[PDB]
């Protein structure tokens, strides 16, 4: 269309002719009609990107974390190719949450071997924090943060206990109150 | 274009 407009201007400034401009206008109208017909698939793409924005931002959060690890130590560096291969292996091996689950377990099982023991614990704990951030509620996040803080000897305090509490927080509270810190 | 329009209007 842009080339047609430029050619129309050049041909009009170059001086049969009326038929040529009529043909150019008809071609432009046909192009506009083609675009108008082709503009009938955008809402599906918008729905797909709105559905997959969560997994996209989770993946870029993981990649930013791994870049931070690579900035810490020269061995822990990471490129985009290995991450892409891991994501492809996820698909080779309530739906979007299931792919997000598979992504977290595959990325942990792939990048555990690239870290030592302390960084293994770091990575496992922080993926646990991110998943419980996205899936669980605000009280869950506050309890997890304050329990990490009392593990950190910085913010000492009891977590938020509710009547219909999940068993995982009770088990971890019992593990940390017994001073079984490695457990 | 204006000259062509003027020629069409005059004729």
């Amino acid at each position: 269309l842009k080339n047609l407009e430029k050619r129309l201007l050049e041909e009009l400034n170059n001086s049969e002719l009326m038929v040529t401009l009529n043909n150019l206008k008809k071609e432009a109208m046909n192009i506009e009609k083609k675009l108008s017909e082709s503009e009938e698939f955008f809402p599906q793409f918008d729905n797909l990107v709105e559905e997959y924005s969560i997994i996209g931002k989770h993946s870029v959060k993981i990649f930013s974390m791994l870049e931070k690890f690579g900035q810490f130590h020269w061995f822990y560096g990471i490129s985009i190719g290995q991450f892409l291969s891991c994501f492809k292996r996820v698909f080779i091996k309530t739906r979007v949450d299931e792919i997000l689950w598979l992504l977290y377990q595959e990325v942990y099982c792939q990048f555990s071997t690239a870290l030592d023991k302390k960084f293994k614990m770091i990575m496992a704990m922080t993926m646990f924090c991110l998943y419980k951030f996205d899936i669980e509620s605000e009280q869950y996040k506050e309890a997890v943060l304050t329990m990490i803080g009392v593990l950190s000897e910085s913010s000492d305090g009891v977590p938020k206990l509710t009547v219909d509490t999940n068993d995982d927080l009770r088990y971890l509270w019992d593990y940390v109150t017994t001073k079984s810190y490695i457990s | 274009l204006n000259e062509s329009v003027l020629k069409v209007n005059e004729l």
Binding site: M18, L21, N22, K25 | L1, S4, V8
Partner: protein, 67 residues
């Protein structure tokens, strides 16, 4: 054919009128646009996105300072 061509080019005529109206604004801002384009060409090959944005804000406010 000539009358039909004249009647069928109203959109082209109003687009040309709009371009001739906006020619004053494009000629007024041509020098600043060339300045900032050369600034990207010779100063932003080795900068990150947020650094590019901050330096762009600084350049824009400093270019608007000199009117």
């Amino acid at each position: 054919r000539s009358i039909s061509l004249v009647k069928s080019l109203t959109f082209e005529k109003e687009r040309w009128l709009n371009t001739t109206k906006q020619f004053s604004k494009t000629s007024q801002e041509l020098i600043g646009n060339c300045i900032i384009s050369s600034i990207y060409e010779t100063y932003f090959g080795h900068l990150n996105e947020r650094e590019r944005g901050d330096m762009l804000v600084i350049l824009k406010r400093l270019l608007g300072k000199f009117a």
